[PDB]
Design a protein around this ligand. Structure first.
Ligand SMILES: Nc1nc2[nH]c(SCCc3ccc(S(N)(=O)=O)cc3)nc2c(=O)[nH]1
Ligand SMILES: Nc1nc2[nH]c(SCCc3ccc(S(N)(=O)=O)cc3)nc2c(=O)[nH]1
Lengths: 273, 264
């Protein structure tokens, strides 16, 4: 499995670490400093995000998101070789990001915004499709599923079809179950436990559990006390064949991923189920 | 519903347990460290540490008794935690059981003269660990047959199968490649229907892979624990108790949401 963007490629034979770079409030200088630290710790992708999608988050104007994101993507692409994912839902941010060197469109809304689908297609870039029930304002009010795995699985079927009809080929797509995006604790763990079953689509799998409440509520610790839990989640995912792990704590995750790599390379079938 | 019995209590092996490592004036600090490990969530304390590492200075019978017995006694009197004892000597096995030890953890699988008979007499649970530039045809198959052999040897000496734990012995006569081969296939050892104990914490199988110092292996050690626990390993022996317990809670939440209750 490989992805292609901006005249390079990304080999998904071994799990990759994606470092989180939030640029919600010198801002540009600190951002590039942080990216650099994450690159040196072994991150091969940086996820640049200028809109909070935490539960209850307020929307951000397109002009504000552009000012936060585009100088940061540009500065990174002009200095390093690391891949760059842009965590946005806005057509214009999608276009302007691709023009300045971004490689992956990581949309938590799966291109649901008006014109987002068409803009993503126009770039040619890889696209991550994430599951969310509802929207960030209300997704955590009362998450409810008869069968969460089935409903997330059905959602991916539907959204894959949707991207194909718009002219985005399967080979550009990634899937992400959306941990924390309209799920209670038990819903998140049902998805993590059956994650390997999403491989049937034959598409890269991306997960983002780092420091989220599925660790906090389970351990009864705050956000700065969740490293061990976060690593445990990362390893559980990567052992089931997840290709990209989105994290805050890059060095430590990269170390854990080596151990997973060694273990999978010693295994016959190269996955746990 | 696997359980072990010792000293009038039981250990419920339906979820993974963290066994903290204790290094053996002494006694006050030992009880202090035991207390910290219990507070961090260890349910078993392994008594020995640096004093009992392979390569360490061999000691006389009377020295090992003087060093080990009062620590086991003091822990048994003050806490409800289970106590694993690191020893190869029959006298120490015997006297440890008298003062409250729950598990005999002999890396030599009771090979020294009298050790097997002394272990049998105590009625306590016994860990069967595999030990030996290393070399194997099929390291899994060699470890497997070693277990078949020790189970029969123990059963010969009157030790019920219900008291045995199996440990593949990470880092004992094994290069990096052999170690990862055993971890990768750890789940296959469940055919014995016996508890599985593993100890990878801070070992060379991490140190060599990541190329870092003894004190910088927490993340790889946690990865190892999680990999083992996801395959149904019952006891994980570690230095970093708090962090390992947190990781094990995540594994337990994952395994409770799974139909199989194990990854293979
Ligand atoms: N592909 C992908 N992209 C992502 N972007 C984000 S931003 C996280 C917003 C947030 C924070 C905290 C909680 S909570 N209540 O669970 O702790 C939920 C959402 N996440 C993901 C993710 O997973 N995948
Ligand atoms: N049941 C059980 N008991 C144990 N006791 C020990 S003591 C540690 C000795 C050591 C240190 C370092 C390396 S190395 N060269 O791989 O880094 C090997 C052995 N370990 C274990 C274990 O695993 N199980």
């Amino acid at each position: 499995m490989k992805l292609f963007a901006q005249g390079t490629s990304l080999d998904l034979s071994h799990p990759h670490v994606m470092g989180i770079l939030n640029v919600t409030p010198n801002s540009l200088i600190d951002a590039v400093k942080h990216a650099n630290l994450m690159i040196n710790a072994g991150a091969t992708i940086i996820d640049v995000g200028g809109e909070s999608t935490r539960p209850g988050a307020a929307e951000v104007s397109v002009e504000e998101e552009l000012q936060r994101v585009i100088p940061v993507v540009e500065a990174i692409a002009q200095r390093f070789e690391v891949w760059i994912s842009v965590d946005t839902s806005k057509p214009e941010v999608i276009r302007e990001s691709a023009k300045v060197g971004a490689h992956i469109i990581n949309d938590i809304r799966s291109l649901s915004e008006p014109g987002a689908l068409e803009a993503a297609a126009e770039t040619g870039l890889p696209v991550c499709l994430m599951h969310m029930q509802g929207n960030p304002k209300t997704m955590q009010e009362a998450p409810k599923y008869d069968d969460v795995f089935a409903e997330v699985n059905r959602y991916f079927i539907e959204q894959i079809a949707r991207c194909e009809q718009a002219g985005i080929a399967k080979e550009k797509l990634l899937l992400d179950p959306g941990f924390g995006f309209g799920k209670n604790l038990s819903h998140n763990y049902s998805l993590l436990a059956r994650l390997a079953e999403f491989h049937h689509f034959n598409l890269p799998l991306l997960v983002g559990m780092s420091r989220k409440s599925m660790i906090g509520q389970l351990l009864n610790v705050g956000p700065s006390e969740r490293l061990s839990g976060s690593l445990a989640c990362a390893v559980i995912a990567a052992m089931q064949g997840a290709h990209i792990i989105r994290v805050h704590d890059v060095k430590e995750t990269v170390e854990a991923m080596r151990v997973v790599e060694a273990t999978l390379s010693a295994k016959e079938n190269k996955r746990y189920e």
